[PDB]
Nucleic acid binder design. Structure first.
Ligand SMILES: Nc1ncnc2c1ncn2[C@@H]1O[C@H](COP(=O)(O)OP(=O)(O)OP(=O)(O)O)[C@@H](O)[C@H]1O
Ligand SMILES: [Ca+2]
Ligand SMILES: [Ca+2]
Ligand SMILES: [Ca+2]
Ligand SMILES: [Ca+2]
Ligand SMILES: [Ca+2]
Length: 901
DNA sequence: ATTTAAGCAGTCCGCG
DNA sequence: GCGGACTGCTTAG
């Protein structure tokens, strides 16, 4: 096999590299890497190296890496550009792996671990590590085994061995229900003292040194706790054995308001799963506890135990250890679904970076672009300092708030990346500038053509047309990958809808799910077999289809995020290719494109309807248009349609056969107007939306910018078995809105769009009557909690104190003295409830850590003093009044003349 | 650890 | 009450 790196580090004048050799074995080497950097040189000096602008360079080969870094410094003192890759490990990887990396994940040791620490005095601080580590579960991907290190004797209690037999048993048997599929994979090791446990753990670690290290909060808790605990017991040299090169650094992570410390383990790539989830999931969750996320992702029940975690080991060590093992498995189950580890490996190896660098789109693109240029013997420019400056973004149309009955939407495929490619936007393709006219002059095609030579953006920038820039070339490569995976995602989605339809008529038989590839549209033969399957088999196929869709989603959406991040990175001051001219060329062209095509679509539809000055485009955001289709439907007449699917078909055909060609013509004209390199504005139909045929549903409504709901029958070619709401911006979509309220508001919207005013009124009346029975957590608001200390004046709210911070201060006073009650963590999320006047907490609200039950000492009082009236008004009635007034609809029946009967 | 536009909740205080 | 200036938070692109 071709060789591939696992990890790379610079330590002084040495590169330390762990890798898989040509025979598939893991090896480690130290290499005295001599890096090269570059200086500009005279034109008369023969060279094969040129900077990105075609200026000649001489290569400087240094005796060692420190000499290279010192030369960069003196080049600054002199005032001259020091060109080349200044991150020497990336240069090392580029030299060592000068081919597309084919990696074999089965050879990469992925370790998933979790530790337990009993603490009788509150949260066990990793920097102090003053309590024994009493359990470690460590899953190894190569062995496919869970290694369980169990402390039997501690200052906080001596316990019996954990029993695998009880662990396997059902909860209803008094067992812990450790999943049967992992029972045979557990290797259990009890220890009668912590020193032996830790010494053995470290010997184990040397034998099975993780390459990828993950778990839940491992970077902020487990890793630093283990490091510091070992350090405190044995000394630093022993703790550094967690690094394969015996090198560690205390790294300070600094944000807006304060800082924290992590331990960098040289020669390990730490990918904390919480951080993977936050970057790659595109969710915003009310809580990031593993219990909460596991429930959300996998629909598994919360790990239940009696009493506080600080007494769980002494009271029920059996359950204590089982839940430690399950916790490790939950993360593996989440990854089986989401495939974020696979994603990181794919992207890391593609870019030729340390895998953990996938968290930095700047690092990722810096590496991609460096490798690309190096291939042509080109030399990257030196990074420079820039002051942070604001720059303009997208255009968003102000909608008239209203119901909108029939709607077809369209938006650009990969808008900003397509703009970069079309215009040829790149550091080295800048050709000059032209004299800019007001944007609206371009939108209306009245401005003088910017250039007859170069490719233009309406911000004034001109680009070469003779050759693609490195930014367009590299963005296209990742775009193509994105497109492939999106194809798989949408096939899986369409396949899912076939199964859902079949589920209406399940056969009464005993059979098996069909062995199929859900990434490809089901063949006719597969469809026939499906119509004969049982519900059991169909449900299993549906689950498999949806898992395949999730896999495709992960792969496509994060590739989308990477390419969009490149357009973004052009406006980040730390990016090597930072240029506000290029960042703004993209956004300004985008503004023009949207408003240009709005004009073209209005003109086209006014033509085919024989009207003048009518606005068919009702809304648009960045790269999208929403077109009112009422007149199209009305031209044939609702009576002519057999059912809902019939008019959906008709609108689908109209969009594909009339609208899209008109849109394409409009954009081809714009490309010529701007003299662009290549026509790449492809605005495909997104949604077909409307009420069910014959119903009183309103179809859709807008309240304002970035706030709307549509009843969608077909999305990007997926024809739903059941209509699906596309709701953007409204309170149903916000993590801050209570769970039960999101749910009730969604049902109000469903009823508005599908059933009409009367149905909405029936539901509102019921919700208003019953809501006080809802569980307090379900009706609690949610907020991030920053700057708690800033607004805390002797335990009371200072000036301008935010509502949620006031709640936290109330909580703090209410739990005062207790070291055992959960503390609110700065920067994390809280649940918030309003409190009735004259409550014993002495303020108008209370807040506590999200994803948790409020501590028992105050739970009863919070429940007694919860202000349901305020809660209902703020979270439910106020937003509903917004939805209904915009839709010109009443949520309560108005009096009429009929009342007199 | 890429980016801008823009929404709503709430505080403070004005608004004769 | 409602608006604007402002902070805080969160979502649509
Ligand atoms: N997370 C982001 N960071 C930077 N720019 C973004 C981000 N999301 C959207 N944009 C910008 O807005 C443009 C339009 O966004 P949109 O969500 O339609 O994605 P898109 O890139 O056009 O991909 P798709 O083909 O899925 O529509 C993007 O091309 C860019
Ligand atoms: Ca735990
Ligand atoms: Ca788009
Ligand atoms: Ca059937
Ligand atoms: Ca869009
Ligand atoms: Ca599309």
């Amino acid at each position: 096999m071709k060789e591939f790196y696992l990890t790379v580090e610079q330590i002084g004048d040495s590169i330390f590299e762990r890798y898989i050799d040509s025979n598939g074995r893991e090896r480690t080497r130290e290499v005295e890497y001599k890096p090269s950097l570059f200086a500009h040189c005279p034109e008369s000096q023969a060279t094969k190296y040129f900077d990105i602008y075609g200026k000649p360079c001489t290569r400087k080969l240094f005796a060692n890496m420190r000499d290279a870094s010192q030369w960069i410094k003196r080049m600054e003192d002199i005032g001259l550009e020091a060109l080349g890759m200044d991150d020497f490990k990336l240069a090392y990887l580029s030299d060592t792996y000068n081919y597309e990396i084919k990696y074999d994940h089965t050879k990469i040791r992925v370790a998933n671990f979790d530790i337990e620490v009993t603490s009788p005095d509150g949260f066990p601080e990793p920097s102090q590590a003053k309590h024994p580590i009493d359990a470690i579960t460590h899953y190894d991907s190569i062995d496919d085994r869970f290694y369980v290190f169990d402390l039997l004797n501690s200052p906080y209690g001596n316990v019996e061995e954990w029993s695998i037999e009880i662990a396997a048993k059902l909860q209803e048997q008094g067992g812990d229900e450790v999943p049967s599929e992992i029972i045979d994979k557990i290797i259990y090791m009890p220890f009668d003292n912590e020193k032996e446990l830790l010494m053995e753990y470290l010997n184990f670690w040397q034998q099975k040194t993780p390459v990828i290290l993950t778990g839940w909060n491992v970077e902020s808790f487990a890793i630093p706790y283990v490091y510091n605990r070992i350090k405190n017991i044995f000394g630093e040299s022993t703790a550094k054995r967690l690094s394969p090169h015996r090198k560690t650094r205390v790294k300070v992570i600094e944000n807006m308001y304060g800082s924290r410390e992590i331990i960098t383990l040289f020669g390990i790539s730490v990918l904390d799963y919480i951080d993977l989830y936050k970057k790659f999931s595109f969710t915003n969750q009310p809580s990031y506890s593993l219990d909460y996320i596991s429930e959300f992702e996998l629909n598994v029940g919360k790990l239940k135990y009696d009493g506080p975690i600080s007494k769980l080991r002494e009271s029920n060590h059996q359950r204590y250890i089982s839940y430690n093992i399950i916790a490790v498995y939950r993360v593996l189950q989440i990854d089986a679904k989401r495939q974020f580890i696979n994603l990181s490996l794919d992207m890391g190896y593609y870019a030729k970076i340390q895998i953990q660098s996938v968290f930095s789109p700047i690092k990722t693109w810096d590496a991609i672009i460096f490798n690309s240029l190096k291939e042509q013997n080109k030399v990257i420019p030196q990074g420079r300092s820039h002051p942070v400056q604001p720059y303009p973004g997208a255009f968003v149309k102000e909608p008239i708030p209203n119901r909108y009955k029939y709607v077809m939407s369209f938006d650009l495929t990969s808008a900003y990346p397509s703009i970069i490619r079309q215009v040829n936007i790149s550091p080295e393709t800048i050709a000059g500038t032209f004299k800019v006219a007001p944007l609206h002059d371009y939108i209306n095609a009245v401005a003088e053509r910017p250039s007859d030579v170069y490719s233009c953006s309406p911000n004034g920038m001109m680009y070469y047309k003779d050759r693609d820039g490195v930014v367009p070339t590299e963005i296209t490569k990742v775009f193509n990958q994105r497109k492939e995976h999106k194809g798989y995602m949408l096939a899986a989605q369409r396949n899912g809808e076939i199964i859902k339809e079949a589920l209406h008529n399940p056969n009464l038989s005993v059979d098996e799910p069909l062995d199929v590839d859900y990434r490809f549209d089901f063949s006719d033969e597969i469809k026939e077999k499906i119509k004969k399957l049982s519900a059991k088999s169909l449900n299993e196929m549906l689950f498999r289809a949806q898992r395949t869709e999730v896999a495709g989603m992960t792969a496509q959406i994060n590739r989308k995020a990477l390419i969009n991040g490149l357009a973004g990175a052009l406006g980040n001051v730390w990016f090597r290719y930072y240029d506000l001219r290029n960042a703004t060329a993209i956004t300004t062209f985008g503004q023009m494109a949207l408003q240009w095509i709005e004009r073209k679509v209005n003109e086209y539809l006014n033509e085919v309807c024989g009207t003048e000055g009518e606005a068919f485009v009702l809304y648009g955001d960045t790269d999208s248009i929403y077109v009112s289709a009422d007149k199209i439907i009305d031209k044939v007449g609702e009576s002519k349609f057999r059912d809902t699917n019939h008019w959906v078909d008709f609108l689908d055909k109209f969009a594909r056969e009339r609208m899209e060609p008109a849109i394409d013509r409009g954009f081809r004209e714009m490309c010529e107007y701007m003299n662009n390199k290549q026509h790449l504005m492809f605005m495909d139909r997104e949604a077909i939306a409307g009420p069910p045929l014959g119903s009183k549903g309103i179809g859709g409504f807008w309240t304002g910018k970035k706030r709307y709901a549509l009843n969608v029958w077909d999305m990007e070619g997926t024809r739903y078995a059941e209509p699906k709401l596309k709701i953007m911006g409204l309170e149903t979509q916000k993590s801050s809105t209570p769970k039960a309220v999101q749910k009730a508001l969604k049902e109000c919207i469903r009823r508005m769009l599908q059933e009409g005013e009367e149905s909405l009124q029936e539901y509102f009346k019921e919700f208003e009557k019953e809501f006080r029975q809802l569980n307090y957590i379900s009706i609690a608001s949610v907020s991030s909690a920053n700057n708690i200390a800033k607004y805390d004046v002797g335990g009371f709210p200072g000036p301008k104190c935010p509502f949620h911070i006031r709640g936290i201060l109330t909580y703090n006073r209410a739990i005062k003295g207790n070291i055992d009650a959960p503390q609110v963590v700065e920067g994390e999320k809280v649940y918030v409830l309003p409190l009735r006047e004259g409550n014993p907490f002495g303020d108008k609200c209370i807040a506590w850590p999200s994803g948790t039950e409020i501590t028992d000492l105050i739970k009863d009082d919070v429940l007694h003093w919860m202000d349901y009236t305020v809660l209902l008004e703020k979270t439910f009635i106020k937003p509903l009044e917004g939805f209904t007034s915009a839709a010109k609809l009443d949520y309560e029946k108005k009096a009429s003349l009929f009342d007199m009967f």
